[PDB]
Amino acid sequence: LKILDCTLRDGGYYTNWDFNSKIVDAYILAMNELPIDYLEVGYRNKPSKEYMGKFGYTPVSVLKHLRNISTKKIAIMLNEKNTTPEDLNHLLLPIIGLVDMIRIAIDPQNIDRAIVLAKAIKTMGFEVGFNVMYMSKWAEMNGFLSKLKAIDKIADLFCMVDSFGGITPKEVKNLLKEVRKYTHVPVGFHGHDNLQLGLINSITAIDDGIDFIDATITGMGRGAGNLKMELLLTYLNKHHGLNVDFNVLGNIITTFTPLLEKYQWGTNLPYMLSGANNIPQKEVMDWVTYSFNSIIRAL
């Protein structure tokens, strides 16, 4: 089992992906002393119209430093809908040797196009990860699962993403079993905490032999956020015999506490509603800003 932390990449939302070196160094060094195998530190992007900070572009200068002080594997993410095979040269060529894995945020609707991208990334020598969204819609997408056999020689990770934060333990088991019937590649799970099922869904996947689990420090992420890495490690230390340095865990939590008190990610009634009814949380929170009853009558 490999544990991947994506705090900076997923939590950057609130700070325009800007993080000062003091937080970045504390984070990287803490990860060295925690049982976390992969660190997804940010995105690689083409020039954005609206401002995006440091970790939205994750420049080479930063990666050389992180690679210098980190003893774990490093990953960055690419948004499939914004990347063509022709963009790979400027996006990835400069980071060869500095980054281990390139994860791709993919909408299941574009899986075939993503496979073309993945294939190209693989020839550059990177490990390739597929972070496929809307796992709650897979079962009813005709021929989708059958399209996964095409990733057998490319994917190093097939990550199931609980996009709405409404997936239940039973559904996670079923989907994992299903994916195993169509692809031989390592499988992962990235749960959201809209219903606070992040921990139990992850433990459920872990006990069924899943290969990868995503989480972030204090669950930092947009809206209801992600599974809290500290919660995962605490649980595994007790029930799975995972050795953990809690002193470091507590210190890294403290590092991110000022941002948490300011931005306060975490679930609430609007996010609980979006999770249980598979509605993107930004849609629902914007409505609250419909009475809640109207939001549910419309369903």
Added chain:
Amino acid sequence: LKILDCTLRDGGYYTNWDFNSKIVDAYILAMNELPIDYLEVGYRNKPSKEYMGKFGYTPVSVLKHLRNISTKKIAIMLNEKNTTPEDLNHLLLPIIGLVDMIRIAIDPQNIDRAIVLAKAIKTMGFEVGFNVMYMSKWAEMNGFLSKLKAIDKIADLFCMVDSFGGITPKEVKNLLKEVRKYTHVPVGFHGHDNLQLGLINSITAIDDGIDFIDATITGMGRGAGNLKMELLLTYLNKHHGLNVDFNVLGNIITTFTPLLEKYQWGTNLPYMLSGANNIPQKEVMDWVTYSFNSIIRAL
């Protein structure tokens, strides 16, 4: 299935059981428009030297008021350790007709002494609930479960309390089965959110036919707190066809928000540790006030 809310009784810890009557009224009226069957509003107590707020005594005058506006079942709690049968007349006689159920906080060690108490209460015409602590220890207590047949004619509810907030779905399912083999009375579950397993533990019990579930608005309660009532209802509304007035839910959450902003109940690293390692939270948090690794090494 009956749902019980004990926000004022459990949450009163922060304000020494004193609440602005505007808060109380808002709470009671809101409970009239939510699918909540029982409301545990406070404790009953013998005169105390140190000052204790209104809901530590739940006076007849406030009960008459609550009984007049609420359309739901009302309950109060007695601490078994501070209650003898001779205390009952002064404690309960005054509330005949105002309170439906008398819940008793019980240590599994003192079950027999508690049954003597429940008999006297039952004679008075009240419904009786057993809130037995440390469910995580019952399985290893010789004769405990096996002797619950003694409550068959006096208990209207046998509530299993997740005292440390570390019990898991599997254990809840097994304990529920065990209890069913020894007593015929309705069973309930009161989970804690130290590991944020309150919801899944509760749903697990509900799916196995449990009779009662405990929760509080925003999970208000000591330390990590309890299952968030808003969370239970949102989940049941989607998965169990439960009709819920989300406008009222959202409003009552708002009513308690200022208290949450001030007291900040909810799990954290110290409480995750105490939950996973079956230690009372006041024990761990007080050590933090031992590094986290030292708290665990001593284990």
